[PDB]
Design an enzyme around this catalytic site. Sequence first.
Site, PDB file in Angstrom:
ATOM      1  N   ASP A 146      -5.394 -93.246  20.510  1.00  0.00           N
ATOM      2  CA  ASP A 146      -4.551 -93.635  19.386  1.00  0.00           C
ATOM      3  C   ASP A 146      -3.070 -93.341  19.633  1.00  0.00           C
ATOM      4  OD1 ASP A 146      -3.904 -94.741  16.927  1.00  0.00           O
ATOM      5  OD2 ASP A 146      -4.784 -93.156  15.730  1.00  0.00           O
ATOM      6  N   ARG A 150       3.764 -93.477  15.613  1.00  0.00           N
ATOM      7  CA  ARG A 150       3.366 -92.699  14.422  1.00  0.00           C
ATOM      8  C   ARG A 150       2.621 -91.398  14.771  1.00  0.00           C
ATOM      9  NH1 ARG A 150       0.312 -97.098  14.893  1.00  0.00           N
ATOM     10  NH2 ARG A 150      -1.827 -96.573  15.548  1.00  0.00           N
ATOM     11  N   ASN A 151       2.059 -91.312  15.978  1.00  0.00           N
ATOM     12  CA  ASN A 151       1.309 -90.124  16.400  1.00  0.00           C
ATOM     13  C   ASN A 151       2.034 -89.229  17.387  1.00  0.00           C
ATOM     14  OD1 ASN A 151      -0.957 -90.570  14.705  1.00  0.00           O
ATOM     15  ND2 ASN A 151      -1.606 -92.197  16.125  1.00  0.00           N
ATOM     16  N   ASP A 164      -0.930 -85.939  17.079  1.00  0.00           N
ATOM     17  CA  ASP A 164      -2.096 -86.257  16.251  1.00  0.00           C
ATOM     18  C   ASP A 164      -3.227 -86.680  17.174  1.00  0.00           C
ATOM     19  OD1 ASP A 164      -4.012 -88.151  14.839  1.00  0.00           O
ATOM     20  OD2 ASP A 164      -2.725 -87.765  13.099  1.00  0.00           O
TER      21      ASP A 164
END
Lengths: 297, 14
Positions: A146, A150-151, A164
Amino acid sequence: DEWEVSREKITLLRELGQGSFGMVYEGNARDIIKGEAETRVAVKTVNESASLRERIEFLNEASVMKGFTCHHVVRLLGVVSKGQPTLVVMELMAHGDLKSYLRSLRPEAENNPGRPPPTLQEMIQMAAEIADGMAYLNAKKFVHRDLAARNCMVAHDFTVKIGDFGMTRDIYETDYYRKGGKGLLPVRWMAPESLKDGVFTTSSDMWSFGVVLWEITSLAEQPYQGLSNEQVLKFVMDGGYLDQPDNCPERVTDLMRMCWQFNPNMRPTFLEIVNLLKDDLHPSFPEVSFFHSEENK
Amino acid sequence: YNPYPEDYGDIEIG
């Protein structure tokens, strides 16, 4: 045990935002880091209404993080697992996620901090930091699955770190993770073979790393804008990839195209990325990088 | 820490 923190030491202050499995809070932690009476921290929790699967994944994510020591990976600080509720205490990242950060640097952004978009040198530094943390994760035999702006998270000194791990899987035995079927999935970041065969490797992470570079140079626009989720699935599986953002430096363009080779065997490794960029970085990099460390063997 | 619900889609893989 080693990770256990006494609940009385943790105070929740405000909401940072909904995480994978529940609300993340900014908090205060007393006597968690040697040399600091009190540290400002991020605290992950599980939704009371979380499914059994989500509860399992939340605990497993915390567990995975216990094994990591890398400057370019967000640090687990402690766990409150006695009584209720479970708190997962981590390094607070002062500038939040990279996607939010990038979007804030848009000329028209209401929250523009009064700084221009990233320069070539800053982009190169971000790239190397992200790649260094990913090379560390891979050497630890996990696949991220992922990777996306955003992570990734941005520290007080603007260091970018992998932040994350809600989809991260052990690959010690086989070097890949496979899972087909229906799912709520980050389709716009996924490699063609992941979408086709449900296979995730360090090469499919490399594909996503390319997309992160695209996010950096587009200030986190949506990849494949104007295509629905199902159209991206078809497009990418049939050999489609992203166009270059306006005014993208050629050096980053070159890297992106290497990341998006259809055949995963042909993509770079994360070590190769750091190596390519290594002469163009802040002098502190060799002192803190996984790449330049004794562990990189 | 911001969530991005639009960055996910219900699809089938594998």
